[PDB]
A paper describes a structure:
Cyclic GMP-AMP synthase (cGAS) senses aberrant DNA during infection, cancer and inflammatory disease, and initiates potent innate immune responses through the synthesis of 2′3′-cyclic GMP-AMP (cGAMP). We identify SPSB3 as the cGAS-targeting substrate receptor that associates with the cullin–RING ubiquitin ligase 5 (CRL5) complex to ligate ubiquitin onto nuclear cGAS. A cryo-electron microscopy structure of nucleosome-bound cGAS in a complex with SPSB3 reveals a highly conserved Asn-Asn (NN) minimal degron motif at the C terminus of cGAS that directs SPSB3 recruitment, ubiquitylation and cGAS protein stability. SPRY-domain- and SOCS-box-containing (SPSB) proteins bind—through their SOCS box—to the elongin B–elongin C (ELOBC) heterodimeric adaptor connecting to the CUL5–RBX2 complex and recruit substrates through the SPRY domain specifying protein ubiquitylation.
Inside the nucleus, cGAS is attached to chromatin by strong interactions with the histone H2A–H2B-formed ‘acidic patch’ on the surface of the nucleosome. Considering a role in nuclear cGAS regulation, we therefore hypothesized that SPSB3 might recognize nucleosome-bound cGAS. Consistent with this idea, immunoprecipitation assays and size-exclusion chromatography (SEC) indicated that SPSB3–ELOBC forms a complex with nucleosome-bound cGAS. To define the molecular basis of cGAS recognition by SPSB3, we determined cryo-electron microscopy (cryo-EM) structures of wild-type (WT) and C site-mutated cGAS (cGAS(K285A/R300A/K427A), hereafter cGAS(site C)) catalytic core domains in a complex with a nucleosome core particle and the SPSB3–ELOBC heterotrimer. The overall topology of the cGAS–SPSB3 subcomplex within the two distinct maps is identical, but the complex incorporating WT cGAS is not as well resolved, probably owing to the heterogeneity of the sample with formation of varying higher-order cGAS-bridged nucleosome fibres. Human cGAS, but not mouse cGAS, can bridge individual nucleosomes through C-site contacts that engage a second nucleosome in vitro. Modelling the 2:2 cGAS–nucleosome complex onto the cGAS–SPSB3–ELOBC–CLR5 complex results in steric clashes between the second nucleosome and catalytic subunits of CRL5. Thus, the mononucleosome–cGAS complex is the substrate for CRL5–SPSB3 ubiquitylation.
Residue numbers in the entry:
A (entry chain L): 100 to 320
B (entry chain D): 30 to 124
C (entry chain K): 161 to 522
D (entry chain A), I (entry chain E): 37 to 134
E (entry chain B): 23 to 102
F (entry chain C): 10 to 117
G (entry chain N): 1 to 104
H (entry chain M): 1 to 112
DNA sequence: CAGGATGTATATATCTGACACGTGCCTGGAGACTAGGGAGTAATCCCCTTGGCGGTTAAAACGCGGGGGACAGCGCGTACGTGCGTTTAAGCGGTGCTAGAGCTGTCTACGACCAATTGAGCGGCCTCGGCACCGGGATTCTCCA
DNA sequence: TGGAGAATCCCGGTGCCGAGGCCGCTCAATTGGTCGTAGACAGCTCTAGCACCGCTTAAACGCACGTACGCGCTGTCCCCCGCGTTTTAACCGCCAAGGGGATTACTCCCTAGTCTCCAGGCACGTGTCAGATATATACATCCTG
């Protein structure tokens, strides 16, 4: 596959986690799970567009494991000694747990079906329209959030189960452009199909470069 | 002060003294008829309170009591008891 | 994962027949004790409560540690709450023609449990020496209801309990309890309410010591009938295919609450927590998820995780209400220390995050 | 040969069902005819409400079924087990209503 | 016209079985027929004697319970 | 003005006190508008019925050669006769005693 | 505050963003700055009705409400026929196709 | 913005503040210079020599573009050069699906 | 010595005399003591009157004399002539008073 | 005063059986007769007192006794009305 | 139109306060209704007779208290006089 | 003046109607005046007696395991208690039947 | 001693009509007031429960001889209990019908109420005659030869 | 076939106490009048007692036959019954003390009667779930061997 756009952050990982597989993989609580542990990704998202996805591997259990977005104002080691949900706790920071429930601002919403061992999850971000979208198993769950404009963020993932691990399978960025915006509007107008390349005399090289740029948009709904 | 007290004596005596002229009666042979007549009183007056509410009759009158005394005397004596209370329903009605 | 649980279930299970071999010793003792007691005017009608299986085996890892309960049938009685505690009552007799049970246990008007137990202790204690084919001994008091406790040789062991039985309508304080309707239909709710109920002797307790002279309700016979006949389909677990993990999920849960006491008995902080609380939380859970479809053996994981989820939630919030008396809070600050509760959340959630380490000791 | 119960074992199966049932033992129409025919010589051309008939039947069943029970206690005291017309005539005069 | 022989042999038997008796004589049947007819002869004479105060051409349930209650035979179920 | 009085028992034809009874009855709660049929019925009936209980003493006193009638003779003159003893048997007549009777199997 | 608008005549189809308080005369100053015809040599028509330079475009109903980012409202320019308004010199765009049933 | 004399009425040679953009079907869309420079094709073309004289006609006709399409390109430029760096919520840019099907060719035709 | 009558004759000669007699047969003062003794368990310090005690013997001995007279009818039906306590417990049960 | 029930003698119970017409007697019956008189008396005397209490008197008089016998259907004619 | 009245609701309300869970058939209600009518009339009959025996013009708590302990057997009388006295003092003290 | 009607039953604490029993005791021709306390005392004893009966019948009905009380269960409750049976000794309950016993020498 | 044949218990599955509800409304249960008389009390008095005494002799407690009643056990043949085959009269569903009981407007005959008068019946003193009672002569019926 | 106690049927004379008669008077029954609503009636309507018609199968009638109950007789030995002896406790006539049941004056607070208002029972009418019903199987008991 094509090379992903950011690793897990060696300088911004909690005091109880090992980064691994060229910082594509990460592992948590390798003995005691004596509290909560977390990381950010190395890249701040606050300009252009972003898309990325994560594969699970250890079986799900324990208090909460979750995926999301937050400011730099978070503390990766406040809950070093305690079980807590780190994501979703504050106006700064959001997340979705494996139980199919979101947190934000220190409050909760049920949002989706559950997910477990070996699951694949994917996320879209648009900073221009200040808005965020969630996918599971190459199918869409929905738009998660909006009104997010000009706030700066890192992507964060958190853990609490002993002997637990995750891997980013792809991560990517783009500008806003016709090949982004018009393609999004086009997919909203024909979401019912498994494909979008159908019926187009449009060159196969351009079909492939939008397989690169918007590989999900052409092939998921 | 003297607190006067009555009995039925003279009214039973005038129904009896018709038949046996040649007799007198000891004191302890009076109480049996007093207590008989007095027993029937509050028993038939209770029947009369019932008779009133039985056929919605606040003016009790002869014909409603009537049934009780063809009832209470078995044999042809049903006719005896009721005959006394039915020979009454003539003259008073005419002043 | 689920294989650890399936394995520990076998390792628990296969101990069973040792209990069956031990059960002969207690049988002869309880049979003699009934034939002792039936001689005395105070006890002429007394009998075994659990007919057809003459014990309850209250700790799953303790195959010598039986429990026995005697029903003492009583004519007709009136009851009133101690101090609006809702679950605790004084009891008094009513309209009865002259056939005295034992009014000699009356004190002012209350039937004295303390007088009852004083005689019950004595008559067992003077009898039991005359068991001559077996070494048998009475073990010293611990609390209100099990005030007679008994040991055979140096293993086989019993706590003895007595209760009043009454035939009447159950109290108004339970009217909203037993929320079985959606799970098992109103036709069973009514016919289960068509049974007797039991009173067990129990002091209230206070900073001043205790209101010694008081009684508490009990419903264990009904509780067994639900668990024995636990299907929305009557035939649940009555054939090999219609099997469901409900029973398994409960007995796994009982075992855990002993393992954590074994590791912290020196701290004493967990000592207040009993398999009674574990049952009560399970009844709320199976009421909440009542279709037999939720209880496939191919789960086991989520239902067990739901038990600990529910129990943690209750424990954080200091709230767990009796399933028959729908407002009596067992977890209340009055009955349990905040420190023990929060400490136990820290233990349980640590075990959950560590994938149940303590079952590896088996 | 085939299955004969011994004399007396079907009579006990009988009292042990009539002592655990509720209903009337005499037929309806035959009791109605007797009531009308007894009545027609106190006065002529009476009419009856249906529940006046049922109130006579219930008062007579409970006169007879309660008189046989005192007849049984009389026959047993005399060391018999079979009831006879001499026991009826005892019960009716110790009961004393004559 | 008879009508007293309308109370059959097996009917008079069922009354004695609910009353608790095991074995029966054969002369009993013409004895009970003389007892039942003299009971009805007295309650019917009082109920028709009430029916005349009450003016009606019909004998009512309440006329018969006034006669039972007068004889000494109180009876819950028919009202009153 | 004020003509000579005629007793209202004689106006009904009775011996019994239609005056005295109307006081008892109307003050007695048993009925409210005491139409003259009611003091007269409760008075009337009992005329023969109060004498029968000594009339039937001709069965006793003259027969037994006594000229003052007495409680024993009044007892026999009720408890003697056929219907008298059902017509009023549910009552005990004080100082009466009992009628002669022996059962036939007990004698020689 | 400035209002996104589009000014239309003949070839010209010109996007603009003027202060809402501008006189209709200031539109003419803007038009001279783009198209060199002086403020009076120009005229203005709305739909097909005369509009006075002495007004402000806000009182003429051209406003932030008419100024949608993807629909800044149309205005009719005129260059005088020496004496009068000339024609409403508008000319039609290339007709767009149907979206086919495979996309429905 | 009033009395827009701009010393000379504009800058219409080296820094020509408007540029004149005709479609293949003759509609003319003047655009301000940052909107002009928003196209990679137009910034490359305006970087061409001789065009920097005040004597230049700063005009293009797009033979490859019809007028309805060219209007949406200008709409997109005016929108993005406004809303870039907005801390406040940027409005959506909805364009009608029944005409928009083609417009992705503008990305490669004009570098946009 | 020689006159001694055959047993059971004097037991017939003496019933005739008591059925001709009319006076009262329980010894008076021994019954008067009992009625004050038995009353004390309902109330206290309580006076009586002569006609209140005299009327109460007439009530008592008139029910005893009426009880024996149909116990005697029960023993004869059992082919006996001696009265014994099994008989009175039948009489005061057919008499309804249980 | 106590135990006057033993004052109901053998020969008094014999006098009362002569009027009933009975010939031979079992020696067990004198202990049975004194058992039935005991509960006859109780149910009468336990109502003459309740009338007396309602009257608030201290004395008990013949009318209270005949109201008692009358209540329980043993009615007697000869002491009142 | 002509109208009828009954004890039915009050005995149903007492039932639903000791077996607050148990029903009664229409035939079984008919017997309970005739039972309370019988007991009222026995008690009232000795109360009206007591007032005549003792020369008075009213029925009050003192009359019914003697009629209850006169018509009720054994320990029913002992209990009923407590249910009586405790309910009137709750009323005079209100 | 006419304020809100507070019914007497709630004051003395009964379920039985303290109002209707007053009107019946007035109209029934028992005495000249009805005292204030009589309708309270009388409703309390009729409460006691009905409450005592209803739960004995309920206990028989519920061991025979039926939803409803019926005349058979009234009979088995009253005719089987030493002092209810004394209180109502001469009344025939319609369609009640008899309670079972066999005389011991018949076996 | 075991083994067969039979009647009762019980546990689903089906269906329908009896009990528990909601509501329109109307008539009987609460609020205020006042005009009398029933019942409450304080003081009185006298008759009738109470407790005591020696007494006569009637009646109860004790004992003892032995006759026949209570009763066990034996014989026995007639009357009644069990059960199979025929056939007849109680109980059921549906029609009619008009005789009779219930409701009501209205009006006039009857019973409650009252003041003034005087006749009926009640309470207290009197006296001889009805039916007891003490001796007693005559006339039966059971029990042994 | 003769005896001889118990009365007992009947009698004499004696005696007393209670029932049969007379008087004073007062209080309750009556005359005469006024008045208001109960109930005696003529019409109407509509529902409950009487009467009729087939059909079904339930149980009343009639019979044979075997056996265990009711019925008679004998012997014997307990358990009263009939008589005399010793004594102890009723009934008896009389007496001294005082307790509370029976009667009055007078005061007032409890009740009935009235008018008004309005909410809790009653009559009505739809729904659904508690028990009756059919059929299959499990079990407990009686009887012959
Ligand atoms: Zn299961």
């Amino acid at each position: 596959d094509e090379y992903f756009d950011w690793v897990w952050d060696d300088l911004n990982k909690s005091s109880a986690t090992l980064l691994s597989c060229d910082n594509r993989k990460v592992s948590f609580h390798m003995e005691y799970s004596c509290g909560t542990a977390a990381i950010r990704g190395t890249k701040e998202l606050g300009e252009g567009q972003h898309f990325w996805e994560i594969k699970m591997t250890s079986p799900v259990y324990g208090t909460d494991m979750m995926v999301g977005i937050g400011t730099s104002d978070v503390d990766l080691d406040k809950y070093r000694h305690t079980f807590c949900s780190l994501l979703g706790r504050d106006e700064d920071s959001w997340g979705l747990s494996y139980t199919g429930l979101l947190h934000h601002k220190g409050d909760k919403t049920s949002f989706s079906s559950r997910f477990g061992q070996g699951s694949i999850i994917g996320v879209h971000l648009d900073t221009w329209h200040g808005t965020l979208t969630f996918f599971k198993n190459r199918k869409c769950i929905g738009v998660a959030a909006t009104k997010l404009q000009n706030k700066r963020f890192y992507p964060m993932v958190c853990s609490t189960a002993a002997r637990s691990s995750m891997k980013v399978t792809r991560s990517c960025a783009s500008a806003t452009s016709l090949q982004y915006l018009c393609c999004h509007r086009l997919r909203q107008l024909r979401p019912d199909s498994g494909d979008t390349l159908e019926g187009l005399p449009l060159p196969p090289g351009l079909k492939q470069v939008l397989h690169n740029k918007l590989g999900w948009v052409l092939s998921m709904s | 002060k003297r607190s006067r007290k009555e009995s039925y004596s003279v009214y039973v005596y005038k129904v009896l003294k018709q038949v046996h002229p040649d007799t007198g009666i000891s004191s302890k042979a009076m109480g049996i008829m007093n207590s008989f007549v007095n027993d029937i009183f509050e028993r038939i007056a209770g029947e009369a309170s019932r008779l009133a509410h039985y056929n919605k009759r606040s003016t009790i009158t002869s014909r409603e009591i009537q049934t009780a005394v063809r009832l209470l005397l078995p044999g042809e004596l049903a006719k005896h008891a009721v005959s006394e209370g039915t020979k009454a329903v003539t003259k008073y009605t005419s002043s | 994962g689920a294989s650890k649980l399936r394995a520990v279930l076998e390792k628990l299970k296969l101990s069973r027949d040792d209990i069956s071999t031990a059960a002969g010793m207690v049988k002869g003792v309880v049979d003699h004790l009934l034939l002792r007691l039936k001689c005395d005017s105070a006890f002429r009608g007394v009998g075994l409560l659990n007919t057809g299986s003459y014990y309850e085996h209250v700790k799953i890892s303790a195959p010598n540690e039986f429990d026995v309960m005697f029903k003492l049938e009583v004519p007709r009685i009136q009851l009133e709450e101690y101090s609006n505690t809702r679950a605790y009552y004084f009891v008094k007799f009513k309209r009865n023609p002259k056939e005295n049970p034992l009014s000699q246990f009356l004190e002012g008007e209350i039937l004295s449990a303390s007088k009852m137990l004083s005689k019950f202790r004595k008559i067992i204690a003077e009898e039991i020496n005359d068991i001559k084919d077996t070494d048998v001994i009475m073990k010293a008091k611990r609390g209100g209801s099990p005030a007679v406790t008994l040991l055979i040789s140096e293993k086989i062991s019993v706590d003895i309990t007595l209760a009043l039985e009454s035939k009447s309508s159950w109290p108004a304080s339970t009217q909203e309890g037993l929320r079985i309707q959606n799970w098992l239909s109103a036709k069973v709710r009514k016919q289960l309410r068509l049974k007797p109920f039991y009173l067990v002797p129990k002091h209230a307790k206070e900073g001043n010591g205790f209101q010694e002279e008081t009684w508490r309700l009990s419903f264990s016979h009904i509780e067994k009938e639900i668990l024995n006949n636990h299907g929305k389909s009557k035939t649940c677990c009555e054939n090999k295919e219609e099997k469901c993990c409900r029973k398994d999920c409960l007995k796994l849960m009982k075992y855990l609450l002993e393992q954590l006491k074994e590791r912290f008995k020196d701290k004493a902080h967990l000592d207040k927590f009993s398999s009674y609380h574990v049952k009560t939380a399970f009844f709320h859970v199976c009421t909440q998820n009542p279709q037999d479809s939720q209880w496939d053996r191919k789960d086991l994981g989520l239902c067990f995780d739901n038990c600990v989820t529910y129990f943690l939630q209750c424990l954080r919030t200091e709230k767990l209400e009796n399933y028959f008396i729908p407002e009596f809070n067992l977890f209340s600050s009055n009955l349990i220390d905040k420190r023990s509760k929060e400490f136990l959340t820290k233990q349980i959630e640590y075990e959950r995050n560590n994938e149940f380490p303590v079952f590896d000791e088996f | 040969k085939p299955h004969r119960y011994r004399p007396g074992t079907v009579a006990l199966r009988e009292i042990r069902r009539y002592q655990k049932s509720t209903e009337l033992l005499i037929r309806k129409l035959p009791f109605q005819r007797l009531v009308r025919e007894i009545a027609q010589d106190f006065k002529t051309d009476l009419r009856f409400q249906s529940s006046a008939v049922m109130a006579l039947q219930e008062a007579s069943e409970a006169y007879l079924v309660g008189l046989f029970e005192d007849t049984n206690l009389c026959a047993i005291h005399a060391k018999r087990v079979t009831i006879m017309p001499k026991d009826i005539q005892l019960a009716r005069r110790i009961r004393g209503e004559r | 016209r008879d009508n007293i022989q309308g109370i059959t042999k097996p009917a008079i038997r069922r009354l004695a079985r609910r009353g608790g008796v095991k074995r029966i004589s054969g002369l009993i049947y013409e004895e009970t027929r003389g007892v039942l007819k003299v009971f009805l002869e007295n309650v019917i004479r009082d109920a028709v004697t009430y029916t005349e105060h009450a003016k009606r051409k019909t004998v009512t349930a309440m006329d018969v319970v006034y006669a039972l209650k007068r004889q000494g035979r109180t009876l819950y179920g028919f009202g009153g | 003005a004020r003509a000579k009085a005629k007793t209202r028992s004689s106006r009904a034809g009775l011996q019994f006190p239609v005056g005295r009874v109307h006081r008892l009855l109307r003050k007695g709660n048993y009925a409210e508008r005491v139409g003259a049929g009611a003091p007269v019925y409760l008075a009337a009936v009992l005329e023969y019925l109060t004498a029968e209980i000594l009339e039937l003493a001709g069965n006793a006193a003259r027969d037994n050669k006594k000229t003052r009638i007495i409680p024993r003779h009044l007892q026999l003159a009720i408890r003697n006769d056929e219907e008298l003893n059902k017509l009023l048997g549910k009552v005990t007549i004080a100082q009466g005693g009992v009628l002669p009777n022996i059962q036939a199997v007990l004698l020689p | 505050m400035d209002v996104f608008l589009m000014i239309r005549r003949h070839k010209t189809t010109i996007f603009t963003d003027a202060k809402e308080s501008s006189t209709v005369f200031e539109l003419k100053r803007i038009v001279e700055g783009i198209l060199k015809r002086p403020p009076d040599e120009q005229r203005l028509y709305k739909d097909d009705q005369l509009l006075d330079d002495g007004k402000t475009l806000g009182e003429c109903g051209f406003t932030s409400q008419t100024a949608r980012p993807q629909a800044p409202a149309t205005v009719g320019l005129a260059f005088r026929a020496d004496d009068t308004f000339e024609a409403l010199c508008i000319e039609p765009f290339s007709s767009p196709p149907e979206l086919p049933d495979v996309m429905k | 913005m009033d009395g827009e004399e701009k010393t000379y009425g504009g800058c219409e040679g080296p820094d020509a503040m408007y540029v004149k953009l005709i479609s293949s079907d003759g509609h003319e869309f003047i655009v301000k210079r940052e909107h002009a420079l928003t196209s990679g094709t137009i910034k490359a073309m305006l970087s061409g020599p001789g065009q920097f004289a005040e004597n230049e006609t700063n005009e293009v006709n797009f033979r490859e573009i019809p007028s309805h399409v060219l209007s949406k390109v200008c709409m997109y430029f005016t929108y993005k050069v406004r809303y870039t760096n907005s801390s406040t919520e940027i409005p959506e840019f909805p364009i009608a699906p029944e005409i928009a099907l083609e417009l992705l060719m503008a990305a490669n035709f004009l570098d946009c």
